[PDB]
Amino acid sequence: MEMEKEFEQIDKSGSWAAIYQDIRHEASDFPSRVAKLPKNKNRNRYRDVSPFDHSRIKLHQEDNDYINASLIKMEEAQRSYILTQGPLPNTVGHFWEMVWEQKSRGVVMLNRVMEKGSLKCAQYWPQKEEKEMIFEDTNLKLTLISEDIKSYYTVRQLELENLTTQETREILHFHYTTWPDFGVPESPASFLNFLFKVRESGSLSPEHGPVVVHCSAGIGRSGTFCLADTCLLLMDKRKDPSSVDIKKVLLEMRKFRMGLIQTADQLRFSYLAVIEGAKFIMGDSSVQDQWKELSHED
Ligand SMILES: O=C(O)COc1cccc(Cl)c1
């Protein structure tokens, strides 16, 4: 079925939980043996969220190459993403090693450091220009260059230096600050405005390594971001945009990391975002300005 009227049909029939459970039943199951080795216990934030062996990112390090991160490679859309957990106190150095080794330009952060009164990830970037960070275990230095705080999100320019070679690179940090503690946003307008800002920066393009996207576990909000991006790219590429099947795209992405999209509410929101985004893309370009306005980012 098409998307927007499949949507109206699930809403009127109140069957989002059943649609979502079908996806959970059909999703791939692949081994994650490296993640479960005892030496890696303090490298995993959640015991039930692990990367598959076949798609895990390997650190370039002969002692222990493990990080809880997965490469999602979308063949038709010609986009790749790295999805990862929020860094832990003992993995912040590994995180920036991965960014360096995979040649990523952008990092997309969809959570706040504290939510629901508990810590959801480590403070893994510097908050003041004059107070840079040094990661001794991986020999990297990280400096804040500039910060632009808007109503729904913040963009930071960072400098990452490999202290072994004295090479330096510019990394862009895209921080969505307004996802509610419970549930999903009422309107996808600010999330789509945010996605388009990431796109406009070059961070998702083939001349760079894959963008790194994370939330707390790296499957729920993170899954919503790449599912919406990939579906919109396919609708632009194809002769028949109504042939994009969001459930089939989601199952393809779940070949590469478990558990993407964590609730039936997140699934419904993903439909909403793709539907609204397909109107602003057209051929209607003015819709982009509309989202910006409706997002009240100032
Ligand atoms: O389902 C659960 O309770 C555990 O898995 C997660 C933990 C934190 C965040 C997210 Cl999205 C999932």
Side-chain angles (χ1 to χ4, degrees), residues 24 45-46 48-49 120 215-221 259 262 266:
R24 292 189 58 161
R45 183 175 287 282
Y46 302 104
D48 57 334
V49 181
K120 297 295 169 195
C215 48
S216 190
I219 60 178
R221 295 174 200 175
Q262 281 178 295
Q266 283 179 359

Side-chain angles (χ1 to χ4, degrees), residues 100 138-141 159-170:
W100 182 268
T138 57
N139 215 36
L140 292 160
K141 178 175 104 173
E159 181 202 64
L160 186 63
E161 182 178 345
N162 178 347
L163 292 173
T164 300
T165 69
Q166 293 194 329
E167 309 168 281
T168 65
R169 279 176 213 163
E170 182 187 321

Side-chain angles (χ1 to χ4, degrees), residues 86-236:
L88 290 153
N90 62 302
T91 67
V92 173
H94 306 149
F95 178 91
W96 287 114
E97 176 183 6
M98 176 177 65
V99 168
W100 182 268
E101 289 169 359
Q102 303 299 317
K103 301 180 157 56
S104 307
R105 179 85 189 293
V107 173
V108 173
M109 172 172 182
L110 302 172
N111 65 293
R112 294 168 298 282
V113 166
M114 178 165 288
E115 300 184 3
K116 295 179 185 183
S118 302
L119 292 173
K120 297 295 169 195
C121 97
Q123 181 60 53
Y124 66 86
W125 72 97
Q127 294 176 281
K128 293 180 182 302
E129 289 84 343
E130 68 278 7
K131 294 277 203 191
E132 77 271 14
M133 288 174 87
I134 295 172
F135 304 102
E136 295 186 340
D137 61 335
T138 57
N139 215 36
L140 292 160
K141 178 175 104 173
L142 182 66
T143 308
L144 177 68
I145 299 302
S146 75
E147 179 169 66
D148 189 357
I149 301 174
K150 305 275 224 301
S151 41
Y152 289 91
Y153 70 100
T154 298
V155 188
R156 307 180 179 93
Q157 297 183 303
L158 308 171
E159 181 202 64
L160 186 63
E161 182 178 345
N162 178 347
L163 292 173
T164 300
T165 69
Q166 293 194 329
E167 309 168 281
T168 65
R169 279 176 213 163
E170 182 187 321
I171 310 297
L172 302 180
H173 194 246
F174 287 94
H175 187 182
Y176 193 86
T177 52
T178 50
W179 194 297
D181 270 14
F182 289 98
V184 306
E186 184 160 296
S187 159
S190 56
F191 193 70
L192 287 164
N193 189 65
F194 176 77
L195 167 61
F196 299 155
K197 296 295 186 185
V198 178
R199 277 186 175 197
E200 289 176 2
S201 78
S203 293
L204 291 164
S205 302
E207 63 250 29
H208 300 292
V211 69
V212 172
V213 353
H214 80 86
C215 48
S216 190
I219 60 178
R221 295 174 200 175
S222 293
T224 300
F225 183 89
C226 60
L227 177 64
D229 184 53
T230 281
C231 286
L232 292 168
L233 208 52
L234 292 169
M235 290 176 86
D236 258 2

